[PDB]
Amino acid sequence: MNLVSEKEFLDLPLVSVAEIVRCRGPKVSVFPFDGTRRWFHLEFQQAALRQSIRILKMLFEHGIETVISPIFSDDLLDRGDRFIVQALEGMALLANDEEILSFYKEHEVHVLFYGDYKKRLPSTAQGAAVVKSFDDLTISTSSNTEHRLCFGVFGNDAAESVAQFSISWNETHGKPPTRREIIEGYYGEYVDKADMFIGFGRFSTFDFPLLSSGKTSLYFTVAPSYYMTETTLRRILYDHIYLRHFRPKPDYSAMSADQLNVLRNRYRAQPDRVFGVGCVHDGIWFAEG
Amino acid sequence: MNLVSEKEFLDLPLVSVAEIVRCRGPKVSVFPFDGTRRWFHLEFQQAALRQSIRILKMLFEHGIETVISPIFSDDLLDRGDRFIVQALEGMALLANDEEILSFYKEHEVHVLFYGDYKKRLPSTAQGAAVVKSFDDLTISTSSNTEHRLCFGVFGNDAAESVAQFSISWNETHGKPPTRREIIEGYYGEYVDKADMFIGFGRFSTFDFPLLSSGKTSLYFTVAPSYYMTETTLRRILYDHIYLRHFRPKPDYSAMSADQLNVLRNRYRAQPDRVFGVGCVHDGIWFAEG
Ligand SMILES: C/C(=C\COP(=O)(O)OP(=O)(O)O)CC[C@@]1(C)[C@@H]2CCCC(C)(C)C2=CC[C@@H]1C
Ligand SMILES: C/C(=C\COP(=O)(O)OP(=O)(O)O)CC[C@@]1(C)[C@@H]2CCCC(C)(C)C2=CC[C@@H]1C
Numbered sequence A, B: 001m002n003l004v005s006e007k008e009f010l011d012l013p014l015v016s017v018a019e020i021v022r023c024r025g026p027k028v029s030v031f032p033f034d035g036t037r038r039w040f041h042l043e044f045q046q047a048a049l050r051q052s053i054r055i056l057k058m059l060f061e062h063g064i065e066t067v068i069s070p071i072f073s074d075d076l077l078d079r080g081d082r083f084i085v086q087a088l089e090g091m092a093l094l095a096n097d098e099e100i101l102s103f104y105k106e107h108e109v110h111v112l113f114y115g116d117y118k119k120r121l122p123s124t125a126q127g128a129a130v131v132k133s134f135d136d137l138t139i140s141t142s143s144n145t146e147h148r149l150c151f152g153v154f155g156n157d158a159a160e161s162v163a164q165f166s167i168s169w170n171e172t173h174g175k176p177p178t179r180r181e182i183i184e185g186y187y188g189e190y191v192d193k194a195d196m197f198i199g200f201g202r203f204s205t206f207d208f209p210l211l212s213s214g215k216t217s218l219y220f221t222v223a224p225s226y227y228m229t230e231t232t233l234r235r236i237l238y239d240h241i242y243l244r245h246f247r248p249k250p251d252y253s254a255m256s257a258d259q260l261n262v263l264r265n266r267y268r269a270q271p272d273r274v275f276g277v278g279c280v281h282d283g284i285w286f287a288e289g
Helices: A006-011 A014-024 A036-040 A045-061 A081-096 A098-106 A125-143 A159-173 A179-187 A230-244 A257-268 B006-011 B014-024 B036-040 B045-061 B081-096 B098-106 B125-143 B159-173 B179-187 B230-244 B257-268
Strands: A028-030 A066-072 A109-114 A147-153 A196-200 A217-221 A278-281 A284-287 B028-030 B066-072 B109-114 B147-153 B196-200 B217-221 B278-281 B284-287
Touching: A006 A230, A014 A230, A036 A045, A045 A066, A045 A081, A045 A098, A045 A230, A066 A081, A081 A098, A081 A125, A098 A109, A109 A125, A109 A179, A159 A179, A159 B159, A159 B179, A179 B159, A196 A230, A217 A230, A230 B278, A278 B230, B006 B230, B014 B230, B036 B045, B045 B066, B045 B081, B045 B098, B045 B230, B066 B081, B081 B098, B081 B125, B098 B109, B109 B125, B109 B179, B159 B179, B196 B230, B217 B230
Parallel strands: A028 A066, A028 A196, A066 A147, A109 A147, A196 A217, B028 B066, B028 B196, B066 B147, B109 B147, B196 B217
Antiparallel strands: A278 A284, B278 B284
16 A cells, blocks of 8 residues: 555556545645646637546546636636636536536536635626526535535635635624634635645646645646646656655664765755746746756 | 846846846745755754855845745644754744844844744743744834845644634724735735745745735745755746746737647647656655656
């Protein structure tokens, strides 16, 4: 269990990997769907929906219980009117399309939505329809317990929301809410800290307030989210589960004088080595090294 | 100004780089001091203090206005009693040592402290001394306006703190606090979102609640924080300022059929390329690729 080689891990059947993940984690994984337009212009609503389902299905079939997936951020008013409509149409799909609803039922997925969407969403018919669809879905899938899916819609800044939720909670309860109750209030249900975040391109994380910690393993694929392969996910999983927090930890004092020199050389050999710096090609940033 | 080459940027005098940063940013930079014991066991309280000052001085002399530096996290009770004492002694240095106090006065630095240190700090003499020292320093350097320095002591989970701060604010004010007021309450003064985070080793961020956004450029050096060189910082600065958000943005539609193929190849050439996966050597994780 604690002694599986990366090669074996990569050769293992899906049901075997899932069992390992159910026991070792990650329990909660953040996976935003970025670089969609780019992916489309290389390989719309019905195409992205399929890929989203593919990846989401992939994540859940690997044992991951909860998936936090940011889909819409405030940077949505940075585009025309046709975007708003098209956007709300995509949001509607998440709660109305038959193939995805079957996905929730097939894999018993409880869908929840977080963010400042109720306020920031265009105060109009189509917008209210989405909100109602979101609430409806959340309750519809309440019976599902195998997996939890959290969609981020304007879920980048929780400060004000937490503040107002705490004030109301204190007014009706008589005491301030616990961290647990604060999280249930934002995500609609309790969710453990994120164990990993899988982004792409520029090194940056976003849209998963209150669930971040120094223990959230970060990963940045070179290609867009939808390009995620089976091999890539397993390599990410393996790294997090067996490599990030290695044990027994290092004992500097008990090491020989040579081991220390070899270690020091690993750092001073390339004294200015940095991960995060990139280069631009056609306006697109690519990580170096 | 908007057309400086990386080479020139690297050749430019310090006062020139600072001027560019004062105009283009980053305005707020997160720089935690990690891998200290490791650095020490390769090159204690008086040694780390010097390096911390070196780097802090480096950051400020490059134009950075605010530096958020996490120094102590809850993972402090993961060690013996001698650690607690030694730790509170280091904390005391930040507010009592003469060379660092001169540093604040020399570079006009306003020092602030954030985190759940008032509660979690050992309810004892030495602990209360630190807390008082912290409050004292914060007020002592209130006249300084050139730079702002925020030290993170148990500043990983702000949820409960924000909740209680909002309840009290609403009770005395009659209305909930704004995001701005919520941030002033946690950090003791208003601070803009973090423009970049410079970590090391394992890809992960931490201890800068409420100040994170998708625009927080992440960087992970291979060697410990104290190994930070002049060249490395400039390469990081340059990347953030001129490369992260390149402009004009890309126009897929207006590109030739070949440019699109070259771009697609940049992604499918190495289909499973991932940044964040590593390898272990002597219990120490090192990023691959
Ligand atoms: C945020 C966004 C585009 C921003 O695009 P970048 O993230 O900026 O990528 P780039 O830089 O390559 O253009 C729109 C989301 C989108 C594509 C989502 C994506 C997942 C869920 C689903 C419901 C399938 C859906 C349906 C249609 C809808 C328009
Ligand atoms: C958090 C901590 C050690 C954890 O060490 P890792 O971050 O775990 O590094 P590793 O893994 O290599 O052991 C103690 C902080 C330390 C070294 C700080 C560091 C900056 C500020 C200053 C005041 C100079 C100070 C004085 C003395 C004090 C003990």
